[PDB]
Design a protein around this nucleic acid. Structure first.
Lengths: 77, 90, 103, 95, 74, 69, 92, 102, 79, 97, 92, 102, 79, 96
DNA sequence: ATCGAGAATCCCGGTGCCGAGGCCGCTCAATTGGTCGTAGACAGCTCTAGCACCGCTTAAACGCACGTACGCGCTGTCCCCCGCGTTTTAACCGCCAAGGGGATTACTCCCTAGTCTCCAGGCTCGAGCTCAATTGGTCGTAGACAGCTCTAGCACCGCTTAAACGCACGTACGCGCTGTCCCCCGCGTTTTAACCGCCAAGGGGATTACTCCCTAGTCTCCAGGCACGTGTCAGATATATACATCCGAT
DNA sequence: ATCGGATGTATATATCTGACACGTGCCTGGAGACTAGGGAGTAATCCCCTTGGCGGTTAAAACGCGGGGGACAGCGCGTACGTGCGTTTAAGCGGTGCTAGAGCTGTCTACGACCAATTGAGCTCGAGCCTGGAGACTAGGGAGTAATCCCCTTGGCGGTTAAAACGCGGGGGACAGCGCGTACGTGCGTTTAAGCGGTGCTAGAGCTGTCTACGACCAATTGAGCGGCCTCGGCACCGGGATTCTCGAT
């Protein structure tokens, strides 16, 4: 499923970051980085769901995970 | 389910009478207010604990504001807090 | 007569006080603390809304949207410092291209 | 007609820094999120807004990391970002 | 330094007096003037020596100094 | 006061300059040259002092005078 | 002037793990700072957990979840193992 | 004592008192300070174990801050846990980037 | 006065040596001093704030430790 | 006369100071700096000795880490000499600027 | 394509000093070079003077002192006299 | 105009603009461009006076570079001021060393 | 190539005549050429630096005037 | 008829100090300038007035150098300028 | 050294024309008329560093013969080499072209903003409700004062390790060239995500009983902290040990 | 890359010494039973409602292939800067001693926040509009990419003033030699700058507190440089006058 994060999507993300030229090897590297990030956040998020004895990951779980990882997200309170 | 929507909107009408605000922007403003609330209240709590005091007073709030806000924001926030407490007391 | 009205505020002094009592911050909360705190939150809300409104007016929009919040926050050095580790949903980023990338 | 290499790149940079729309396709991102979640807890479901939150977080993180990567590329008197740039940026960030 | 401090100072003060009244001098100002004067004179004497040797002499003479100063643009 | 720049002092200066023999008439010429130099340098130094509204010529004024010459 | 610390417990653990090894005062101070730091992290996260779930009691469940959030990988698994064993021994 | 009932060395009673007086919640369960004390004890034991190993590698019988820094930074998970922590009088790990060597 | 100059060139070199730096540009030293000064200000400001909040006239080690903790640079060993 | 080649003594010093733990800034000049900076915020302050030592530990740990990152940036640019732009990149990526 | 010069002002001065005398293009170029050269010298010295005295403004005093440094003897005295008369007339 | 207010022919405004845009100082006094214009005008007038004199001595009505060179080199203070200056197409003053004559 | 030989013997004689020189050793001419070449190099080098700073490919009169000024040989009339 | 050595020389001095025309041939100097510039950067072009400026500067420099050389020659009680005179002039000027 | 007599040459009398120069239109843009805060600037006051102004002193630099040998100067020539007429060869030059790419402008294309038109999104008036304002008693937390001994601050000084400054200099950084991969742009084909609709049911949220787990009050006696004395490991000191690096040679 | 000598780091080491962490003793406060009260966590239980699912359509984006220009990475070379060391200062520092301000600890006590009702009051949701806004379409514009055309190069065909060379003879360059004026190392007398010191003091630099001069921002304006059109002392030129030089002269 990691291959679903397509090359043009990563290019667009890089464009928003102001990048003008992109090595061919960036894409696979970026995918790896993304997976790690998601794992970490999701690991905390799902943990919160489990403490509450729920089976549905909520927006608050993800926001809380991001906050406790120092990546506080505004707008989904 | 509580929110700051009406108070944010009142402030907006004070600063821009003919300007509105989107739902996403209001949600972001509520998140913002909650964030700053948590930061200031938490720092005030630590100040009180650090000094073996059981009461959070306006002085703890003011010191926390001085710690958390940079420069000009800190000076105006302290000024607004002081003005507000003096107006409230009388 | 409400406490916010006596304090000259728009933010709810009573609600902030209750949130302080129930937020497990201290066993007791002084009467002046929620007035001061509410005043600080109101000041910051007014400042952010001021800049965001300005950005909206530059964009010939009558409603502040998240994009204007990002412009307001990132274009103010001290607000950007206060919210340095905060993500504004649907905010995007500031327009910025490094000089070395230009022709 | 043909634009020179970089002109359209700059146009795309301005275009995507001007806008705010989400840049990853909804369905593959959701599929990835569910795949990763499955390896932590069985039988999980997701609120729609939870996936949208995760997507906002992922793209904001990647855009910031790519900003730093670009600064790292320029630091080496290059204009092309490479994997070693990403690894240095992530090392200095403490990741 | 090769000139005695005090007579050099006396000379400096006399010359300064003809430009502005009531002047005083910092010690390091006089030391600066002395370093500058001695460097200038040694260099001028170097050039004078080159002028003397040019004329197949070993004795420097006023005409040597005057030639050196003319070529320097003084 | 120009005569305070004595004959043996000028001889020592010439020795440092590598001069082996010195006409007797050299000394007055050197004194004149020195005097001219001093006038110019001091004129500039005092000019700077007056601009700074001071009454004490400083070492830095002299250094600046030398630089501009 | 009564100042409490964890010094004796750190020393007892040290004697458990390295019977013939000692420890300097500076190192003991650093260990005390460490224990207090981790105490604050776990207790604070547990408090937040209880608040988040509208619970007024911090139980071993909040402690365990806080440990899982705060500790990395195998450290988290071992800490959870120690905590569970300790709570089960205590209840009996 | 509750620590003895739980088989621990760290003071369960003391941790419980600090929980009551740290204003974390209105109520605290009976099992919470036992678990917390056990986790704190385990982490202390792990750091002291690694630091002792380092101390013996250096032929020293007394643990000093340097051994604590070596123990923490040379173990990936402790280094992660203490990523933003300064160990006073700890120094740094010996490490020279390969390209600078002759 | 001008006390930033007490952070001498050989001291900055030594700090760089501990950081693994082999060669140091001449402009680094002044640059480093500026950075250091900024850092100190940020810490000391917060420290003094705590001192002022406590109505004390002596900055204690605990004020500094707290300033560092709240600036994300938690320091162990002076509690 | 004997002479070590450029870099040998630098490396020896790196090994020496990474092996040891003593503070690298002179005690008294740092103390004077700290007192000056504090005095420009509030007059007549005093300091506990351990407070100044804490500030010194913090400053040196911060600088050593910053110089590590600076070195990584230098090596990235195929240089061996750290430069101001290296410090600025390291601090920009750290989020200090 | 507009190139500014001092030609008309130099020519006006020429008509003041020699009413029935003209000037060649090459000579006009030399006069323009002259004015630009002295401008740079005087302005630069005045800037340095202001810097030396920790002043950020060039006033008639720095210009005057620079003029005294740059011009010889009677030329300096005459230039200073002209400048003072001009500044005092301007102020009134 | 400010030149007229000062009784001058050289352009005070132009000198002021050139001072503002030459990056010489952050601020420029109101009297500085007036003073500068007056000095530049005086020196220009003195050289043109002497060059005209030389031109008339050569029974020429137009000043050419030769007259400028003659004017500058035969006047001690102008020659000093322009000691390191080349007047294009100026030539040199006629001068033969006495020892060279028959 | 070898264009330095274009500074001919009669040209050097004419320049010496304007300088008031009546008699010329046979070795002066080559010596003069060397001196001239050095002079030109020094001027032209500086001129080209200015041209390169301006990112232009044509050396202008102003580049030369600036080179001469900064070498202490200010030339009037080509501004 | 034959003029004695020096009469025509003196006449030539008077002639060229009276006039102002440039004394080096334009085009050979131009080749020299282009050669020297090309040995710094290839394919350079030159403005016409740039070459004339370099030529004016060179001839003014040389005339002044020959003046100083003559003064050094006269100083040594000679009337013929020689290489050591040029070298003395340049040493005192500070060019060597 | 200067008298004359003849001659190449520079300067004066008078002239063609002539191209650079003096004079006029214009537009437009640098120049200037008011205006505002704003910081840079002027003005006063201190006071002490350091400048000044002099009373011995003394010892080394300065001054007066001195005579005396060294270098300046002044001719006397020999030989070299350099000015000057003359001619001839030729590269400088008059004047014209030529391509010779190079060049700021004009043809051409999609891009970004302008203008205008029908809607998804929130504004506005009307009722139930948990929460916010009052104030009394109260019980305790904090504000304030007295005292102390703890410790931070100020000052002298040996000596010495470290810091500061100068000399090579060679390992380094920075810049120009260039071979070449390799990634940007464009377009045609294929998925595959977006959209819209409809349903399912499994899990989140509200409701009510209760009982087990947490708290409240309080005595104690035992674990834990404050000293305390001390004996073992750390700091130190010269041995001397083998490990690193520099400088020739295979 | 390997191998020795020669110095030059650290590492191991036996010996000595001293500081401090550990076992011990003592004190006091708090952790643990202990009981009862009450309050929230469990457990259904019930509803509803939100995202899996599927299905179908559709249409916009990801792939892939290709073209081709442009950044990467050596490679080499210039120059020049931090280093290593040496030598000479400079303040750190550990000591030692004084000395007084504040952290702390304790006492006392008016201030104030917490419950407890108690009212009622602002928020919040529902129903009912609606009116700026998204965007749909479209038109001027900003851009490059060539592209015809002027600004600095490069033949060319001689024309032709001048350089190369002879050579030819005549005027210096330099060596010899000599004659003599004159600096200079010695010697002895002197006399004054350096040094120290002691006292009297004008202003340099700093601190402070107001004060006004201009960098802009509009906003309106005439002086002049580009461009073009008459116009005249000057440049080249011929004729002639008056000269500067070279014999001829002792």
């Amino acid at each position: 499923n990691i291959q679903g994060i397509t090359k043009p999507a990563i290019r667009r993300l890089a464009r928003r970051g102001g990048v003008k030229r992109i090595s061919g090897l960036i894409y696979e590297e970026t995918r790896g980085v993304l997976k790690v990030f998601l794992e970490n956040v999701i690991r905390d998020a799902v943990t919160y769901t489990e403490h509450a004895k729920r089976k549905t990951v909520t927006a608050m779980d993800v926001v809380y995970a991001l906050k406790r990882q120092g990546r506080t997200l505004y707008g989904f309170g | 389910k509580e929110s700051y929507s009406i108070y944010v909107y009142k402030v907006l009408k004070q600063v821009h009478p003919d300007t509105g605000i989107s739902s996403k922007a209001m949600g972001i403003m509520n998140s913002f207010v909650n964030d700053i609330f948590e930061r200031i209240a938490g720092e005030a709590s630590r100040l009180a604990h650090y000094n073996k005091r059981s009461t959070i007073t306006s002085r703890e709030i003011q010191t926390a504001v001085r710690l958390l806000l940079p420069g000009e924001l800190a000076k105006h926030a302290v000024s607004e807090g002081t003005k507000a407490v003096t107006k409230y007391t009388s | 007569k409400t406490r916010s009205s006596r304090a000259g505020l728009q933010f709810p002094v009573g609600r902030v006080h209750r949130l302080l009592r129930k937020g497990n911050y201290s066993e007791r909360v002084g009467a002046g603390a929620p007035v001061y705190l509410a005043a600080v939150l109101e000041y910051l809300t007014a400042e952010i809304l001021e800049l965001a409104g300005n950005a909206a007016r530059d964009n010939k929009k009558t409603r502040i949207i998240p994009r204007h919040l990002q412009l307001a926050i990132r274009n103010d050095e001290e607000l950007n410092k206060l919210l340095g580790r905060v993500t504004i949903a649907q905010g995007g980023v500031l327009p910025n291209i490094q000089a070395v990338l230009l022709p | 007609h043909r634009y020179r290499p970089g002109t359209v790149a700059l146009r795309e940079i301005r275009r995507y820094q001007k806008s705010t729309e989400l840049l990853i396709r909804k369905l593959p991102f959701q599929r990835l999120v569910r795949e990763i979640a499955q390896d932590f807890k069985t039988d999980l479901r997701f609120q729609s807004s939870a996936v949208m939150a995760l997507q906002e977080a992922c793209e904001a993180y990647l855009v910031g990391l790519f900003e730093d990567t670009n600064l790292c590329a320029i630091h080496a008197k290059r204009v092309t970002i490479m994997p070693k740039d990403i690894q240095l940026a992530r090392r200095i960030r403490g990741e | 330094l090769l000139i005695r401090k005090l007579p050099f100072q006396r000379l400096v003060r006399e010359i300064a007096q003809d430009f502005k009244t009531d002047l005083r001098f910092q010690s390091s100002a006089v030391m600066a003037l002395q370093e500058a004067c001695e460097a200038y004179l040694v260099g001028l004497f170097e050039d004078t020596n080159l002028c003397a040797i040019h004329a197949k002499r070993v004795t420097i003479m006023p005409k040597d100094i005057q030639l050196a100063r003319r070529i320097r643009g003084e």
